[PDB]
Amino acid sequence: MSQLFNNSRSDTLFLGGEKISGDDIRNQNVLATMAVANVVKSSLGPVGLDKMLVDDIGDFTVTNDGATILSLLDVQHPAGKILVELAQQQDREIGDGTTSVVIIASELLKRANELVKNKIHPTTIITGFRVALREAIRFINEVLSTSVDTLGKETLINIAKTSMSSKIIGADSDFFSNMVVDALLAVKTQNSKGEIKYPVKAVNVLKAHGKSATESLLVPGYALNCTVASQAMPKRIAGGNVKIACLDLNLQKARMAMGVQINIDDPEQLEQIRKREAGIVLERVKKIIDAGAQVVLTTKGIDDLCLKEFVEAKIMGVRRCKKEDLRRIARATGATLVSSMSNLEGEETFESSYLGLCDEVVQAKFSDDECILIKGTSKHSSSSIILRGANDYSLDEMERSLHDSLSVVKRTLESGNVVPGGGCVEAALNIYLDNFATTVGSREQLAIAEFAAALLIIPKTLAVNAAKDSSELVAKLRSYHAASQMAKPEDVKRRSYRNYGLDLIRGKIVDEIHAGVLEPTISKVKSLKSALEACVAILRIDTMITVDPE
Amino acid sequence: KTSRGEIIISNDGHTILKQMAILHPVARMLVEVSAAQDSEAGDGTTSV
Amino acid sequence: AKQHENRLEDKDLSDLEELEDDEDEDFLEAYKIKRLNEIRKLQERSKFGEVFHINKPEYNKEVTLASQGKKDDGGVYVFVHLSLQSKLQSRILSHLFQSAACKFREIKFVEIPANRAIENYPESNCPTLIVYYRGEVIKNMITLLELGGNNSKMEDFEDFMVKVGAVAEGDNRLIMNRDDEESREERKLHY
Amino acid sequence: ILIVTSNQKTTISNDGATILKLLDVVHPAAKTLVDISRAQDAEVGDGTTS
Amino acid sequence: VFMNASQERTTGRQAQISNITAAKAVADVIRTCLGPKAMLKMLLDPMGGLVLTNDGHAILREIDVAHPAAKSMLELSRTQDEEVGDGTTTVIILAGEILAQCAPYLIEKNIHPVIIIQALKKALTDALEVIKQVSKPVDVENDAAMKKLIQASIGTKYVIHWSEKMCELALDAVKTVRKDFEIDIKRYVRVEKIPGGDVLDSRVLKGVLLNKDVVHPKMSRHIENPRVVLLDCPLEYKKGESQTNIEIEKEEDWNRILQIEEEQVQLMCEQILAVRPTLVITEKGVSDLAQHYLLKGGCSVLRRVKKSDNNRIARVTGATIVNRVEDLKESDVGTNCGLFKVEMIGDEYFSFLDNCKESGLQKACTIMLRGGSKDILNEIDRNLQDAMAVARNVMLSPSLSPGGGATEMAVSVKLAEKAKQLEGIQQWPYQAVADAMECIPRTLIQNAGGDPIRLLSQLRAKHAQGNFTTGIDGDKGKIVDMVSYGIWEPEVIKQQSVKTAIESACLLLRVDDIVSGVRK
Amino acid sequence: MGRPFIIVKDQGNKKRQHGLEAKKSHILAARSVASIIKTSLGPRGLDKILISPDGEITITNDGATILSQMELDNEIAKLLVQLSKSQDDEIGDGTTGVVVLASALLDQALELIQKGIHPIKIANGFDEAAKLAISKLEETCDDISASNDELFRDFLLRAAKTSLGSKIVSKDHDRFAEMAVEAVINVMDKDRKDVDFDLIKMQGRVGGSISDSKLINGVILDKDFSHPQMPKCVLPKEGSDGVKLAILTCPFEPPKPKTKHKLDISSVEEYQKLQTYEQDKFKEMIDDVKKAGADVVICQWGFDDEANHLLLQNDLPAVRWVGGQELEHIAISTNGRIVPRFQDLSKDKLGTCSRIYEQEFGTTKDRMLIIEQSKETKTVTCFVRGSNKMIVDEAERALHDSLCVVRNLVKDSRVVYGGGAAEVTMSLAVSEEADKQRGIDQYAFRGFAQALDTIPMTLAENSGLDPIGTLSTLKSKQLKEKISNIGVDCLGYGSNDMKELFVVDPFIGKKQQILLATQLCRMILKIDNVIISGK
Ligand SMILES: Nc1ncnc2c1ncn2[C@@H]1O[C@H](COP(=O)(O)OP(=O)(O)O)[C@@H](O)[C@H]1O
Ligand SMILES: Nc1ncnc2c1ncn2[C@@H]1O[C@H](COP(=O)(O)OP(=O)(O)O)[C@@H](O)[C@H]1O
Ligand SMILES: Nc1ncnc2c1ncn2[C@@H]1O[C@H](COP(=O)(O)OP(=O)(O)O)[C@@H](O)[C@H]1O
Ligand SMILES: Nc1ncnc2c1ncn2[C@@H]1O[C@H](COP(=O)(O)OP(=O)(O)O)[C@@H](O)[C@H]1O
Ligand SMILES: Nc1ncnc2c1ncn2[C@@H]1O[C@H](COP(=O)(O)OP(=O)(O)O)[C@@H](O)[C@H]1O
Ligand SMILES: [Mg+2]
Ligand SMILES: [Mg+2]
Ligand SMILES: [Mg+2]
Ligand SMILES: [Mg+2]
């Protein structure tokens, strides 16, 4: 919208870029926000559709998440970098509402810039949003609903369908909702003296393009993507109570430390020195072979000198891997990760307590790949996810989609209270805040009124993505909600309305309880606060100063 | 926006004047006055 | 490419009739109507044809107004001659004006004594040739040493008129392009 | 509003009739405001800015 | 300006139009590469080689398209090759049609790209049902039917004339790699090539085939019962993991240092002669001093052998991978070796290792190829991968689906009949699934030169009345039932074709915009 | 939206400005233009050197001549070029004062723009202050029309010496001021007087010194006679002292029509006849002039050769090639009228002159005629000299400014007394009304008061006197005493009363300084958007 660039000024000489002031900055900041808001506006909801981004080397990424699509969009403008880092803050903390928090912040900066043109100060505008948000969080506490009289895991299933939607695997949500809920119940633990927590990225994802997403097999146990050391080893260990030994010790032709320089006068010492230098590693592996470790795990590789005894003793070897995956194998099998084998006494040894326990271990072939599937752990249960698709780009889409689905159900179990979805929260907060500040009167009624209209952009964005009549749904949403808030406490039917709203598939008003649309209360909590601080950071900017690079 | 890739928001007049690279030396003296006001008093760096 | 253009471009209305039996009628008569219209424009523009022996009050009109013409920017070139009967080059240039006046009727040929033109003009600088066009002086020419001097010919004067934009290069009236009939007769026999 | 075209001739004005005439508009949608301003200037002669 | 984008944003309906046109363009390149009368394709890579083939996977490996929607179609061939190993062109040609038929609706009747996805999963669920019903089981131990099953894919290749030998070649190789569930893998299937010779004398031989000869001339070139022992370390004197740095003071030390270099190689050689092997295969290089005293005992020394071949030798001879020589015993020594012999070929020497043939570890083998040139070898080698891939599916799944487009045509008829009873908004994309499934017989009729108008009309008239095994004869171009025609394919290839083709459409249909040139 | 975003052509060269900072450059740009000409104000001023692109050089102190023919970039300074010019064309004086006074209003208005008052409201305060200032000056204005012509003759010297005092011509202000006054005595009608400025010509010759300049009554010609053997000085004889100057449009030439024509010449009979035709024409020509009794004949175009000798025989000199614009001015002074043709020539339409002479100027090969008249005639022509080309141009412009200053006295006899007396008188008038009418525009009245004080402070700055003692003395004295003709004495006299110092200015001249300044600054303040298309 800005034209006729600002003139280079001779009275104000600053090194680097030229200074520019006035309303053009907030116009340029909003224009920079629309450059990123229009990108994420189309990929919202189930009816929303996403786009592709090439990496200039033939590779590309078809992305639904707001954090991923903005991470690859390196925004040179300063105001856009705030929203880019906000989505990186949003997905790491909560893992939900990454698209809505950017859309809420864009609509706020739109109407906030319109209010600044209406000649009210931004300080009064910010005070209007904070008092409104403090009442909004108070209203979110009123509309909570505790799960009760529900048969089995139905509340965890249908709430996952809301997060599973807006993806390619939303059609298969009936199949993935069971295994996703069963996966998080398998990695349950105890911490902080009774506080229930689950670990971050505990469930694995293995990229095996193949049969289909419908036939994704839930292996009740841990899975690891590693190649066999020697191909002569057995790929299936029979018999129960298989002992797993987790290590981080190297079994190779080891070298002496840096500050050792061997110097000998006798020629015959080279025979013993060359054998003892290799034989010092044999003392480490001879003790663990006698302990009966059927399958050894290690971070650092194993050279061919020590792979003979494993082939002769029928022991499975493991090559390089990540440091974090072996920690959870030790927790599930009951082993202990040893950085360096030793003992408190003056002699080296290896105890039996360091060994794990599992029922069965086998190397399954996922159509080109060697992966050691562990199942039936004794100490703590575990789980893994076998993703399957048409091509590798879809598997990458399935990775972050499950990461969002796992994150939503993770925060669902932290707090039993839930809130409905489908724009009912935004539709109720609109009418609730319009009624608010009528007694206040003078100045903050216009600021809070436009704030209430800013939250309506989400049910408007979901409608146009469906390519349907949007105002017909907005007339039903707001009116129904209003007729519910005004109503007597004693009116069952009307009160219920407070509970339902927009539907994107059939295009009519139906109940969310029977439909199954549901979200956590934590997803809306601290989402508007992040959008509020995002609006405050750009709205308070008057002039822009740019220094050229040296 | 500084020369390097760092971005910083600033209401403080001392940090505004510090990050702004001024070509005129007399106007550059106000950067040191705000540094002096910041070191001695620590309040009212723009009022001076 | 030029072989197709030479049929029409390199033939006047009198020469275009040669291709009446060979070329198509619609191809030929379409261009003859175009060339016929151009001939009619030159007849309407033929407002001159003899040397206008003028005097000064009039200069402020004949030399300059004419140069504006219609003011359709109908400009008109006006060749002035500051004559001086004592000089030998002046009488030569006066003969070239009357010879060119009979041919180029669209261009105005003006003559006046040099003593009556400018107050106390240098006699050594005479004869002087000025060329007006739309009120602006296109060329302030000095004595005819550039055009051969005493040995100036009609061919040299016609070549100067092409340089100032007064006559086209491929005009059939110029002696450079107006080949003799005996010359073209020998070309057809030896072809 | 002070406008200076490419020919370097100063032209100060208050009404929007001649301001839009000086600025040669390329965009067709922005020419709609210029056409009504000249039409309002030609018919009535007031309210060209409003 | 703003961020590195907004060059020319293809948004709205025109973006999806380019993807359907781009996805259709990939199938048009290999439209003629289907059926028994399929044409070959010579692609020119920029390095300097050449790829002569008709397989859609090998064609699409070498091609390079600068478009992101077509690259997702490019990756589907790797899904089919690294899952079964047959029907890669079938996957690419079917999806093109699915994206194309769904297009009319997307462009005009405005059905949103999510309602089409819901229609396809119910079509996918019904497709597996009718494919399960149309397929008939078959006995796995019947060698007469197994040869006809293996040569179904060979018929669409150049070596159909040698199909009597290739089925015997592939059947013996698959049973060797097959482990007694019934899991097999092609990493031990050696693809060693020999330029020149006739295809008739080419045969599989139990064991390995090296490219090297013996080192010393006195080594026995013909051993009755070889006893192979694998070594990983070199026979050279190991310098050690740390520097020696011997401080020499007396004159009798340097000759001692050079003498222990001779005695250490004696010590490792003498303990190898405790079991008295005939052939010692070392992974790393060998020294000149050590080979003589191994010959004094009667061994045979070779050059450095890469351990990809030593792992095959370990399963053939039954030996184990051994690096420490001090722990060498008599139990880990390879035995039951058939014969040892070295032939003379002008390219390089070739050492043969035959097996006695008489549970345990799975046995490996090497398949001899005697082609006409280098490209003929690579052409025939890919045919074995396509032919041996068929043999795995019948063992993993005893089901057997009819070929010749009868399976996909059966999907077309049932989806078309059931589309009338599926009244609603899902009826239009559900009925469009049958329009593409009837194209994979249409491509066979076009390559055969017949008119697909009356043939498909005659096909649907006889498919409901005659039988479920009706199909088109690709050579003659007439309707011939698959029972009398005697050519059948596995049902697993039909599953991956329907699953991968529909699942590819669900990904590409969700594409809204295309923005190129963001960053690396 | 795409990466291109175009609405008008050539957006790269066009750049807008807006906000308070955009207006800040405009007033500060006027300070640079004002500060250049700030030192040239008053009698102690210093000239400016100008250089054209063609290499022609000139020197001057007039604000309109300085700002004119100068290469500028900013548009606001070009408005000041048109300002000074405005005062010059109409008034011809006050070109530096109106620019300095306009900049003073802008400098005082910036402080107020800085407080939060709208710019149009500031200009409304100056309008009520300006009308009250000029109304108060009109109240304390003295009229000199009641006096007779003798005392009124002296008042022209008091004002002519003022404007000539601020130039380089002031080495003899008593001498050259008579030249500016005596020229207007010959054109005034003595009742409902009009200047008739077009009759008064002005020409200066580069040569000699400025002290040799003497006023004449006639027309100065820059051309020689038709033949050099004619007598230089021509006197009258026994009766009819007027020389009977005959003026002609058509020269001595053969008669012929304008249109193109060819005279058909027959056999030898017609060839010999036409020789007698033109030979009898010249005999008829010389008899016609001698019948009229003319002594000097001038034509706009040159006579034929034979014709140059035929006039020389009868003692009948002639000048030739007299410019067409110059020919009309000769007839007015001589009380004659130009004949269209020679057949209408008679005694009544001939001229009248006292004496003429051909004046030589050193070794140069040029001739100038100097017509003189013994009695009071209609027109008058200045005769300026100097030792340089630019000093004659400076003397012509200094005399032209004084000629326009006395021109205002003829059409309007109500005069004032400037030099800081009118400014301090008008400054305290609005200040005394500011605290009576506090309102919100009191700061605009105070800004208008302090803006008027910059002029006498500039005169105090250029004269070296202390502005503190000078400004405090005028404010304290003028508030006490009602006499309003005390100002800043720049020449260093002991008394500041201007009754004795012989300084007078016109009311129309001092009024236009405030009107054109306050009316321009309204336009300068109303600019918000500033678009400058780069060339
Ligand atoms: N099946 C559904 N029915 C109604 N609304 C839905 C459904 N699925 C998702 N939504 C709505 O779409 C919005 C965005 O969902 P989603 O795209 O999964 O999250 P994000 O905004 O983090 O990408 C949510 O606020 C939710 O209310
Ligand atoms: N709540 C308030 N109401 C009115 N004026 C205030 C308030 N708080 C501060 N001020 C005024 O505003 C000024 C703020 O100065 P400040 O911005 O703190 O300087 P700096 O940021 O350089 O320390 C103070 O000088 C004070 O007079
Ligand atoms: N004396 C007044 N009182 C109130 N409003 C006025 C007055 N004069 C003008 N206006 C308002 O100012 C607006 C703009 O008028 P103006 O810009 O001067 O005319 P135009 O837009 O035709 O150039 C009009 O809409 C009018 O209502
Ligand atoms: N002899 C044949 N007659 C008719 N159709 C055939 C014949 N052989 C193969 N087909 C058809 O060609 C398709 C692909 O077979 P094939 O060429 O073996 O695989 P690929 O497409 O990988 O080369 C099969 O779906 C089958 O229906
Ligand atoms: N001798 C003097 N004594 C007192 N005041 C003088 C004298 N000469 C000039 N002034 C004052 O100085 C001012 C100078 O004006 P001037 O510079 O001649 O006009 P401009 O500024 O247009 O060039 C006059 O208005 C007059 O009031
Ligand atoms: Mg989501
Ligand atoms: Mg108006
Ligand atoms: Mg095949
Ligand atoms: Mg003056």
CSV table of N, CA and C in Angstrom, one decimal, chain E residues 274-302:
chain,number,residue,atom,x,y,z
E,274,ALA,N,47.9,-75.6,11.7
E,274,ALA,CA,47.5,-76.6,12.7
E,274,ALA,C,46.3,-77.4,12.2
E,275,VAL,N,45.4,-76.8,11.4
E,275,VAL,CA,44.3,-77.4,10.8
E,275,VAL,C,44.6,-77.9,9.3
E,276,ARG,N,45.7,-77.3,8.7
E,276,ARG,CA,46.1,-77.7,7.4
E,276,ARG,C,45.0,-77.4,6.4
E,277,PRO,N,44.7,-76.1,6.1
E,277,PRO,CA,43.8,-75.7,5.1
E,277,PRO,C,44.4,-75.8,3.7
E,278,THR,N,43.5,-75.9,2.7
E,278,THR,CA,43.8,-75.9,1.3
E,278,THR,C,43.7,-74.5,0.6
E,279,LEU,N,42.8,-73.7,1.1
E,279,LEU,CA,42.5,-72.4,0.5
E,279,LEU,C,42.3,-71.4,1.7
E,280,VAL,N,43.2,-70.3,1.7
E,280,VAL,CA,43.1,-69.3,2.7
E,280,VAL,C,42.7,-68.0,2.0
E,281,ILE,N,41.5,-67.5,2.3
E,281,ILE,CA,41.0,-66.3,1.7
E,281,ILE,C,41.1,-65.2,2.7
E,282,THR,N,42.0,-64.2,2.4
E,282,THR,CA,42.2,-63.1,3.3
E,282,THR,C,41.4,-61.9,2.8
E,283,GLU,N,40.9,-61.1,3.7
E,283,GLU,CA,40.1,-59.9,3.4
E,283,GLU,C,41.1,-58.8,2.9
E,284,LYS,N,42.1,-58.4,3.7
E,284,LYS,CA,43.0,-57.4,3.3
E,284,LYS,C,44.1,-58.1,2.5
E,285,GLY,N,45.2,-57.3,2.2
E,285,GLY,CA,46.3,-57.8,1.4
E,285,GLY,C,47.1,-58.9,2.0
E,286,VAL,N,48.0,-59.4,1.2
E,286,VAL,CA,48.9,-60.5,1.7
E,286,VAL,C,50.4,-60.1,1.3
E,287,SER,N,51.3,-60.6,2.2
E,287,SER,CA,52.7,-60.3,2.0
E,287,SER,C,53.3,-61.4,1.1
E,288,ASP,N,54.5,-61.1,0.6
E,288,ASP,CA,55.2,-62.0,-0.3
E,288,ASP,C,56.0,-63.1,0.5
E,289,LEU,N,56.4,-62.8,1.8
E,289,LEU,CA,57.1,-63.7,2.6
E,289,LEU,C,56.2,-64.8,3.2
E,290,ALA,N,54.9,-64.5,3.5
E,290,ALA,CA,54.0,-65.4,4.1
E,290,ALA,C,53.4,-66.5,3.2
E,291,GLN,N,53.3,-66.2,1.9
E,291,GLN,CA,52.7,-67.1,1.0
E,291,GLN,C,53.5,-68.4,0.7
E,292,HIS,N,54.8,-68.3,0.9
E,292,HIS,CA,55.6,-69.5,0.6
E,292,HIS,C,55.5,-70.6,1.6
E,293,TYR,N,55.5,-70.2,2.9
E,293,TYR,CA,55.4,-71.2,4.0
E,293,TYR,C,53.9,-71.7,4.2
E,294,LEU,N,52.9,-70.9,3.7
E,294,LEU,CA,51.6,-71.5,3.6
E,294,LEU,C,51.5,-72.5,2.5
E,295,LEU,N,52.3,-72.3,1.4
E,295,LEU,CA,52.4,-73.3,0.3
E,295,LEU,C,53.2,-74.5,0.8
E,296,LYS,N,54.1,-74.4,1.7
E,296,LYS,CA,54.8,-75.6,2.2
E,296,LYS,C,53.9,-76.5,2.9
E,297,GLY,N,52.8,-76.0,3.6
E,297,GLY,CA,51.8,-76.8,4.2
E,297,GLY,C,50.7,-77.3,3.2
E,298,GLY,N,50.5,-76.6,2.1
E,298,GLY,CA,49.6,-76.9,1.1
E,298,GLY,C,48.4,-76.0,0.9
E,299,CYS,N,48.4,-74.8,1.5
E,299,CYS,CA,47.3,-73.8,1.3
E,299,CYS,C,47.4,-73.2,0.0
E,300,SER,N,46.4,-72.3,-0.3
E,300,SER,CA,46.3,-71.4,-1.4
E,300,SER,C,46.0,-70.0,-1.0
E,301,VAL,N,46.8,-69.1,-1.5
E,301,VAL,CA,46.6,-67.7,-1.1
E,301,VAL,C,46.0,-66.9,-2.3
E,302,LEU,N,45.1,-65.9,-1.9
E,302,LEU,CA,44.5,-65.0,-2.9
E,302,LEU,C,44.8,-63.6,-2.5
